[PDB]
């Protein structure tokens, strides 16, 4: 059972869950990749790598992805997450030069992967393998706006790192800027492209109805995870969520802080119910009997229903997740699968 203050029974009743048939040969492949790689220690891949259930979360979000598409995509995934690891445990231990010399690294190896693939920092060297596989997909526009996009994430988590450090929590509308970033909004969003074996020209996808459906799907992700990993958040010392914000610039007791997230998480999903509508009739209208409006039709449609799977995914992924099981750790403030 979701506990009561997590559960959206929208979601549980009106978004059905989706695996992609990948799924099982995905996890086993992310799992061997995080050892090749060495991106966690061989005894807590054997504990905790399928109980993160990172592969699961991908596969029931970029359904109808080719599967070397969502083999690449799980990988830089399951690193994401490593590197919000090694960033907050960089920060928590004080590692100011260990922190910019690997956003200096990521910045450089995102523009150019394939020199990076056996680097010493096998963060970095993961970062470049999965990147190299993913640019091999579309066109180099598409990488570029990839690069683009995470040039704009590394910074936002160099930002994170000064808070954190400095002892800074954001006010409410800085941090839903910055959450955007963190998350990791566009990069999610430019990467249902490949999954659907599309780049879609800017007049495609930046059409207001794609724009703000793609944006509510992970303005619902990011909040809802802030819901969900706020607990092991303040054990943890992050400041870094939407209920923090909240507790500290407006006043509100946690419980009334948590109330006010939820009330923001469900009123996405309605939003997005609606813009989901314009979304569709925007496929529809692109299938104009051509040949290439029917590619850009489906490649829409297909879009946009992974845009819907997000919804849950994420919220399923919060529940099964071994990550956010701070009711397990003996030490709150230090999760088992981190390397402290
Ligand atoms: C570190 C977590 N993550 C993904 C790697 C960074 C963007 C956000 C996320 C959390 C939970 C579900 C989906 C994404
Ligand atoms: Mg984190
Ligand atoms: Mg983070
Ligand atoms: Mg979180």
């Given at each position: 059972a979701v506990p009561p203050s997590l559960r959206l029974p929208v979601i549980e009743a009106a978004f059905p869950r989706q695996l992609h048939p990948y799924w099982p040969k995905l996890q086993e492949t992310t799992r061997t990749w995080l050892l090749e790689k060495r991106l966690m220690p061989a005894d807590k891949v054997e504990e905790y790598a399928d109980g993160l259930c990172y592969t699961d979360l991908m596969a029931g979000y970029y359904?109808?992805?080719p599967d070397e598409v969502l083999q690449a995509i799980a990988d830089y995934s399951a690193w994401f997450f490593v590197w919000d690891d090694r960033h907050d445990r960089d920060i928590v231990h004080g590692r100011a030069g260990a922190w910019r010399r690997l956003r200096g690294l990521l910045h450089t190896a995102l523009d150019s992967p394939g020199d990076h693939?056996?680097?010493?920092d096998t963060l970095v060297a993961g970062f470049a393998d999965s990147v190299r596989r993913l640019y091999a997909f579309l066109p180099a526009t598409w990488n570029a706006r990839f690069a683009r996009h995470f040039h704009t994430v590394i910074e936002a988590y160099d930002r994170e790192f000064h808070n954190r450090t400095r002892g800074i929590v954001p006010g409410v509308e800085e941090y839903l800027e910055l959450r955007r970033l963190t998350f990791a909004h566009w990069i999610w969003t430019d990467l249902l492209e490949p999954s659907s074996g599309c780049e879609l020209p800017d007049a495609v996808r930046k059409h207001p109805a794609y724009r703000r459906a793609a944006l509510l799907s992970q303005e619902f992700a990011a909040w809802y995870n802030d819901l969900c990993s706020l607990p092991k958040e303040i054990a943890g010392d992050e400041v870094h969520n939407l209920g923090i914000s909240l507790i500290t610039h407006?006043?509100?007791?946690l419980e009334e802080a948590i109330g006010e997230v939820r009330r923001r998480v469900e009123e996405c999903i309605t939003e997005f119910l609606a813009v989901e509508r314009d979304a569709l009739r925007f496929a529809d209208e692109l299938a104009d009997g051509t040949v290439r409006g029917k590619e850009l039709s489906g490649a829409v449609r297909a879009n946009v229903g992974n845009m819907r799977n997000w919804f849950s995914s994420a919220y399923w992924f919060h529940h099964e997740s071994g990550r956010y099981m701070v009711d397990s750790w003996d030490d709150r403030s230090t999760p088992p699968y981190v390397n402290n």
């Open positions: 359904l109808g992805a693939l056996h680097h010493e407006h006043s509100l007791t």
